[PDB]
Amino acid sequence: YLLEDTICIGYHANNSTDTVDTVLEKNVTVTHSVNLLEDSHNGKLCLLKGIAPLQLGNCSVAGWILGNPECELLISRESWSYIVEKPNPENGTCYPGHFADYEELREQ
Amino acid sequence: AIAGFIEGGWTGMVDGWYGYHHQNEQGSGYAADQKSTQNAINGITNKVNSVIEKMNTQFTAVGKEFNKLERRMENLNKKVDDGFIDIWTYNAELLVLLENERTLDFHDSNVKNLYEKVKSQLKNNAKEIGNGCFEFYHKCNDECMESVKNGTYDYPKYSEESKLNREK
Amino acid sequence: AIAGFIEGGWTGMVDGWYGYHHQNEQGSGYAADQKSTQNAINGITNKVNSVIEKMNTQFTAVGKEFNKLERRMENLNKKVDDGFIDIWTYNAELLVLLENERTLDFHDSNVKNLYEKVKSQLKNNAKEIGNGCFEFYHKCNDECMESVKNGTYDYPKYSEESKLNREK
Amino acid sequence: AIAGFIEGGWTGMVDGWYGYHHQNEQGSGYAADQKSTQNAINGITNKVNSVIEKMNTQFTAVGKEFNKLERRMENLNKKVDDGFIDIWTYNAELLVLLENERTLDFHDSNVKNLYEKVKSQLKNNAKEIGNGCFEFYHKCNDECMESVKNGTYDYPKYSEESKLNREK
């Protein structure tokens, strides 16, 4: 009829709504977890290992390197970590012709 | 054990992962077993660090640009890029699924073992009543209680003291 | 458990993976425990789907053709093709070996747990006789039987009824 | 079990991995259970062979040399070489970590099972005294001893012989 002195063994619980998947079960809510997948960017063209890139505006590598009159980028840079070009620059080889080994120069 | 014979978890225990709940003449309390908890915390952390830190990457520019007379190289390069994504996506997805099951199984085996510790000391000086609950056949003080926890529990000091209330 | 203390399997049980065999005054029967069976069926299916469905492939033409003055590219391309085959062949062969052992271990732990369920309800109202066989110290009807199965077994309703034949 | 309830290992047992230590009127001895030991030796060997032999490699020259106007190909090739090293280094490091834990867990489950064998035969014809130590309530000869080992132990032939010293 009565309940004397007791010791109960058990486990922790909390307000966590985190869910994981196992090889045997889906959508298992858990106390503590860790995300391994980066799904978010800052939306900015940052510096790389302390060095800024070379923004070319409306110029292509060709336009900038040949010195197309619409390309100048004022008092210019002397080191860059990578290059920033627009999907379709509008200022390149203003006088038509073939640029030899262009993809090679771009890489170098 | 976890969602098995011990149906749920304690929102009352905030000092650990696995532990105990005692009630006596002095009062009731939630106490986490700091030895099984720490070894589980350290162990899991190690698993996680291994998954993250083992991935070491050097500086690399993935992209390659080709001309209209370099379609084979362009495709060779796509084959590389895609083959690596295929491998990492499969491996990563499967590793997480496998070791998440392993982690969950590991906790279960720790609570089943924490239970067996208490069952081993309190041979017939207590009764298996609820889930992971044990019902003392003797008067277990805030002293005897905190002694079941650190495993230094004295079976004889309460062996005969239990026998009286036992046969009844 | 599997090929362990329970030596073999029942060709008589066709309704599940793990179950029971009862014999009483009414008759004998093979009944699969539909709860442990279903959770095992669902779980394994998930493991399998994960192994198959996680492998997603886009449209690709592996082959590349080179000229007599493109032996380096030809070989670069062989290096890619072979490196990927080496990885998939090793990973695939090893994953199957590892998770086949894991599947087999999982069934074993389910039958050992199904046993412990029955042992937990029938504390000393029965005797451990054979492999996974329990010998009732009381008259267990087609009613009490089907009650050990769904875990709603009434220990007191047969507690004293056992005691008589027990001491003998 | 391993570094658990059975605290340490025997430098005295040199004939196997898991076994027993007996002491009686005849004398004391260290004897390895050659059935659990062999199945563990064969099993682990298989795991190892699978890790080594599954790695089959054909004849290949990794290195490729390019000219000053082939920097893209040079880098494409570096991307391949590095991508494969990244995969193998991660996979290999993680496989070893995972299956080393699995091996260690496997030994533990074998000693816990070897214990339960002995506990199953010697129901109450002996007492659980130390770690994996059992204290006979009867006179167990070099004959009865070597019979607990091969599992052909005769419970009745010593059942009543124990009862006398038992109640005392």
Next chain:
Amino acid sequence: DECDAKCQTPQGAINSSLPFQNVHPVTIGECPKYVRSAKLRMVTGLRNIPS
């Protein structure tokens, strides 16, 4: 922007401490490996079963 990174994507920079990313396949830097996955979460704690 004036920000500093270890990994640059065409749409913005990424935190390189994690082993994987599903942002963009073509990156520049010390980058997490690109994966097609939507979630990659490892359980550390116990199943949250509080009722």
